[PDB]
Amino acid sequence: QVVKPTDERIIDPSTANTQLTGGVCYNTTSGGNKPLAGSPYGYETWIDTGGGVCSLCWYGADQGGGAAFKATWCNPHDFLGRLGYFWNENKPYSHYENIYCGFNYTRSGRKTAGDYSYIGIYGWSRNPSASNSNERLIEYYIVEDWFGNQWQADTSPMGINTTGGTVMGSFTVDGSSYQIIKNTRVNQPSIEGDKTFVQYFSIRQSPRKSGTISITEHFKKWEKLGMKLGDNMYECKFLIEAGAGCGFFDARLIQFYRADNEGNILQITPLHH
Question: CA-to-CA distance for 266 and 133, rounded, in angstroms?
């Protein structure tokens, strides 16, 4: 019994399908979070100079819910483009209350993003007091959609053969079941250098290109399964990741907002006939 917000500044994602223009584009690796002018958000790009042309283009503070962007890649070697909240102020997820993201995008078709790919919500968290040192750094994904590959349709949810790890459980939210997976990344690149850390995934069983993500509901369910996030959330951004391929992602809407359990808006973007 968390009340879903009904505030009229919330844009209905189902009909938010007007092509945006006037993007500001970034074609190289950003080197972490970069803040956006007149916006609460920041972007990050990871673009391999050894691959082909990639970009992320932000649609600005006054349209598309304020976090909308278009991304492109061609022969990338794991392109990541992402935009949303950057935190990293020593607070657990629960400090940020009930986080929601409304979205609506187009993208290139099946098998245009390599053998693995991810679309949805992404970030990191820190939990230094965790007794298992593997669990002191967390990378997370809520996966609404992907590009499939030669072997599996983009209409079929990815599994542990793509993510690695172990199915911990599942639940239903925002109109679909989600499979919850935990994976350990052993001596791999992170935001703290090469080390061992864990990854939490929620995989939407019915992939989709528009709707609302009740982000905090994922965080709550992960923690019930022993998948703890700790006390210093790094960020919470909308992501497209392409392992390879040549394609695009083009959002007409990405709108983050936060509300308390009564459903009152604490933060929303944007902001007479």
Answer: 35
Q: How far is CA 58 from the centre of its chain?
A: 15
- Exactly one of 44, 135, 139, 144 is catalytic; name it: 139
Domain hosting residue 81, numbered range: 1-273
Our count of domains for the chain comes to: 1
Gap between the Cα atoms of 267 and 273, Å rounded: 23
Calpha distance 23→81 (Å, rounded): 14
| Cα–Cα distance for residue pair 266/257, rounded to 1 Å | 8
Please state, in angstroms and rounded to a whole number, the distance separating the CA atoms of residues 119 and 130: 29
- Do the beta carbons of residue 123 and residue 72 sit within 8 Å? no
Euclidean distance between CA atoms 45 and 241, whole angstroms: 10
Solved with: X-ray
44 noted as active-site residue: no
Known catalytic residue: 241? yes
Q: Which of 123, 131, 139 is nearest to 197 (CA)?
A: 139
| Identity of residue 137 | L
For residues 197 and 218, is the Cβ–Cβ distance under 8 A? no
Please provide the DSSP assignment of the chain as one string: -PPPP--TTS--GGG--PPP---EEE-S--SS-EE-TTSSEEEEEE--TTS---EEEE--TTSGGG--EEEEEES-SSEEEEEEEE--SS--GGGG-EEEEEEEEEE--TTSS-S-EEEEEEEEEE-TT-SSGGGSEEEEEEEEE----SSS-TTSPP-HHHH-SEEEEEEEETTEEEEEEEEEEEEE--BTBSEEEEEEEEEESS--SEEEEEHHHHHHHHHHTT----SEE-EEEEEEEESSSEEEEEEEEEEEEEE-TT--EEEES----
**Which is the catalytic residue, given 135, 144, 235, 241?**
241
